[PDB]
Write a protein that binds this ligand. Structure first.
Ligand SMILES: COc1ccc(C2(c3nc(NCCN)c4ccc(N5CCN(C)CC5)cc4n3)CC2)cc1
Length: 300
């Protein structure tokens, strides 16, 4: 991890970057701010190329569509809490997800959005903005405090609050038992396994395949080739994470590295070719009126 770029929010003495993702245009990073703006930076020169007022509160999350035409954003306490934005020609809101704190695109075909409202998953059509499904069963709920509903790689299944749902039938096919208070889980990009906090579960037998105590309270992200898994631990303008992330082999879940950048992390992502890792790193203290974040790009 060799840092090869670094920059802060132009003209802000308290740099307010909160989240980042690469755009479909390689040299250009998308970042959210603690005041609700979407910025586009040149990830090498640190030049601010563009700025949009998307929300009334800090952006917590953004996901561009692979084709470059759409962007999801989520916010902290503003209404709508999440939104879908067209980026062809003019930047503009297509749909708003009024009380979803988190949103994700479907994976195989990006024709759908899945949103989380506490313990409830909402699935929407991109083209209409209509809610196609509500996935919630109060008897099966685990009430995970950081629940983030997600689709599997083939879009036929949803993981919501540690419950596995068949999308076509809107049936709960399995509830994974609750073994932590916070982390709800992700699908492995291989589609054979789900990672719920420290437990790796088989998707056919629901067998426990690995116990990985190092993953406790970690938000997990794969690289685009699905060979490396990045974990950043939640800590118990307050960052969601601490000052370190860990990498694992996505195949056997062996630890590769533990990097302490010694600055609280707000977010991290990779380019689609997995050459770089962008990290939003806070300068100065937990106990500060504000944050002062920078974006650092590391060559992997
Ligand atoms: C599975 O565990 C999870 C799941 C989801 C999250 C969320 C998140 N993710 C972030 N970035 C990583 C994903 N984009 C955030 C970044 C900054 C930030 N705060 C908000 C308030 N404000 C005072 C300063 C900025 C809040 C964030 N919340 C809500 C999506 C965190 C941990």
């Amino acid at each position: 991890f060799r840092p090869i770029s670094v920059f802060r929010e132009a003209n802000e003495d308290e740099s307010g970057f909160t989240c980042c993702a690469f755009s479909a245009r390689e040299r250009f990073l998308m970042l959210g701010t603690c005041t609700g703006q979407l910025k586009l930076y040149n990830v090498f020169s640190g030049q601010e190329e563009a700025s949009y007022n998307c929300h009334n509160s800090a952006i917590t999350h953004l996901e561009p569509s692979r084709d470059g035409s759409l962007l999801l954003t989520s916010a902290t306490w503003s209404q709508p809490l999440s939104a879908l934005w067209g980026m062809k020609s003019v930047f503009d809101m297509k749909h708003s997800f009024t009380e979803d704190h988190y949103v994700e695109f479907s994976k195989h075909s990006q024709d759908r959005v899945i949103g989380t409202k506490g313990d409830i998953a909402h699935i929407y059509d991109i083209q209409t903005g209509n809610k196609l499904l509500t996935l919630f069963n109060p008897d099966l709920a685990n009430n995970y405090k950081r629940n983030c509903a997600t689709f599997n790689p083939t879009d036929d299944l949803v993981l919501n609050d540690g419950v596995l749902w068949d999308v076509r039938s809107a049936l709960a096919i399995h509830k994974f038992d609750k073994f932590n208070m916070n982390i709800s889980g992700v699908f492995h990009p291989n589609g054979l396994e789900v990672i719920i906090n420290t437990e790796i579960w088989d998707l056919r037998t629901f067998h426990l395949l690995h116990t990985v105590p190092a993953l406790d309270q970690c938000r997990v992200v794969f690289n685009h080739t699905g060979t490396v898994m990045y974990g950043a631990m939640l800590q118990a303008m307050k960052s969601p994470f601490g000052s370190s992330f860990r990498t694992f082999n996505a195949t056997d879940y062996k630890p590769i590295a533990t990097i302490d950048v010694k600055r609280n992390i707000f977010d991290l992502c990779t380019d689609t070719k997995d050459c770089y890792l962008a990290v939003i790193e806070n300068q100065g203290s937990m106990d500060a009126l504000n944050m002062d974040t920078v974006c650092r790009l590391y060559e992997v």
